[PDB]
Ligand binder design. Structure first.
Ligand code: FAD
Length: 471
């Protein structure tokens, strides 16, 4: 089925590859683009898998994957209808070109000098320009790694459609599920599973070594508030939990913690970060970053004269922060688009400041930008929330749940300071300069946050700065 040659080859069929395909076709209306995708699905967005797809009373949603946004309006998880793609066989000579996807196929060898890749089925494909957009593989716990096949078979590493379907099934079938990891994803899943368990009368546990949810990122006040929110959903949250081992004890999973607590459960979900998919660097002879992970690229996202990297797999040069890798939807879209533009001769640098967002449900959301690390000095400024300061209202206003879309990618032109907390802004500092911002239930203000960080001025009074965020 695979053609012998394609002008544009995109390795991996995720968010970054789809953005690049769209960019290439916009700039070159007759372009011929092939996406090679190891997963059996056509390109789709990930955020709904831990969010709106769980907030449903319709059993058909697991089959269609057409979810309802917080505003009640339906959207498909897929970036475009399957009929918008051309067949890989037709690609070389179909009038006006198109975008094809080879699903269920892995690129296993990259030969840079020969502009060639080899698939797992032995197929050889040459390219003129290549994007690596392979994303990452979920990290496991060493305690699970060392526990043997039975424990492993009863642990979900949450990333794909397949994991959504298998976990949604498990949540209807078993009595107890344990999430390991306190980050945004672990916490989203805790809230999603918690809501399911309430209707079924079952148990959800979330455990992590930090003092509270998102403890590596949020300062203690807001980390603690989040833990209480998750507890209000019915979830048993266990902070200061260091996993010693995991075994099977008369049919149940048994998690032993260093402090002496034991946790008995039916299934485990791990959400403890990501290992960038860099296997192709071996045969490709490409440099990887041993400190931050990922393929090292220049300002234009090039690994080689005709090889670019975008999305989760890229270790890029952040304009403010230096060598960096992120796991942001926004980054995958903007870096993928830019790769596509540069593959069609734009030669433009990656200067975008990537934003991140998380919704715990329709009532609580976060946004983040820049260097966000709870070990840094911070200043938090908080206020009571208004009726509009929640993900649902933000989605009602914008028409979308993908916040990188509603926020805009832009930075504000100017930021003239105007002359039971439920929202706020948190500034992360270096010598009175703001290097990162977290927004709690404040929407449509990311351009202001980008402007503050880009300008890099010293600020005498952060309480004045907070007025820009309507605090
Ligand atoms: C459940 C979940 C929820 C998330 N929610 C948010 C959110 O709310 N906000 C936010 O900012 N970010 C969120 N993220 C992160 C965001 O989704 C990612 O940053 C984004 O998916 C990265 O896109 P990508 O194209 O780089 O990688 P991916 O989407 O991982 O795509 C990579 C693809 O390449 C395939 N592949 C790998 N190797 C090969 C190979 N050799 N040959 C062929 N194919 C290969 C993989 O199977 C995969 O399909 C979430 C992530 C997850 C998993």
């Amino acid at each position: 089925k695979a053609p012998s040659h394609v002008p544009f080859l995109l390795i991996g069929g995720g968010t970054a590859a789809f953005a690049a395909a769209r960019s290439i076709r916009a700039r070159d209306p007759g372009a011929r683009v092939l996406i090679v995708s190891e997963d059996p699905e056509l390109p789709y967005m990930r955020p709904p898998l831990s969010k709106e797809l769980w907030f449903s009373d319709d059993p058909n949603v697991t089959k269609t994957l057409r979810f309802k946004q917080w505003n009640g309006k339906e959207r498909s998880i897929y970036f475009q209808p399957p009929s918008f793609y051309v067949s890989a066989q037709d690609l070389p000579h179909i009038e006006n070109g198109g975008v094809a996807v080879l699903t269920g196929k892995k690129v296993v060898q990259l030969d840079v000098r020969d502009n060639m890749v080899k698939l797992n089925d032995g197929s050889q494909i040459t390219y003129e320009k290549c994007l690596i957009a392979t994303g990452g593989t979920p990290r496991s716990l060493s305690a699970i790694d060392r526990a043997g096949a039975e424990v492993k078979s009863r642990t979900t590493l949450f990333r794909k459609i397949g994991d959504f379907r298998s976990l949604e099934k498990i949540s209807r079938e078993v009595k107890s599920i344990t999430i390991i990891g306190g980050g945004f994803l672990g916490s989203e899943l805790a809230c999603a599973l918690g809501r399911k368990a309430r209707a079924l009368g079952t148990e959800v546990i979330q455990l992590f070594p930090e003092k509270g949810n998102m403890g590596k990122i949020l300062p203690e006040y807001l980390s603690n508030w989040t833990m209480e929110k998750v507890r209000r959903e019915g979830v048993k949250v266990m902070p200061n939990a260091i996993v010693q081992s995991v075994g099977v004890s008369s049919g149940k999973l048994l998690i032993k913690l260093k402090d002496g607590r034991k946790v008995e459960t039916d299934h485990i979900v791990a959400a403890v970060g990501l290992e960038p998919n860099v296997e192709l660097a071996k045969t490709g002879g490409l440099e990887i970053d041993s400190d931050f992970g990922g393929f090292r690229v220049n300002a234009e996202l090039q690994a080689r004269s005709n090889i670019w990297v975008a999305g989760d797999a890229a270790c890029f040069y952040d304009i403010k922060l230096g060598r960096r890798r992120v796991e942001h939807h926004d980054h995958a879209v903007v870096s993928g688009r830019l790769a596509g533009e540069n593959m069609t001769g734009a030669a433009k640098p990656y200067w975008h400041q990537s934003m991140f967002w998380s919704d715990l449900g329709p009532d609580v959301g976060y946004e983040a930008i820049g260097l966000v690390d709870s070990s840094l000095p911070t200043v938090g400024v908080f206020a009571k929330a208004t009726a509009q300061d929640n993900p649902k209202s933000a989605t009602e206003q914008s028409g979308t749940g993908i916040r990188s879309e509603s926020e805009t990618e832009s930075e504000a032109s100017e930021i003239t300071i105007p002359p039971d907390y439920g929202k706020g802004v948190i500034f992360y500092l270096r010598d009175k300069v703001v290097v990162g911002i977290v927004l709690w239930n404040i929407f449509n203000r990311m351009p202001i946050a980008r402007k503050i960080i880009k300008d890099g001025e010293q600020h005498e009074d952060l309480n004045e700065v907070a007025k820009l965020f309507n605090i």
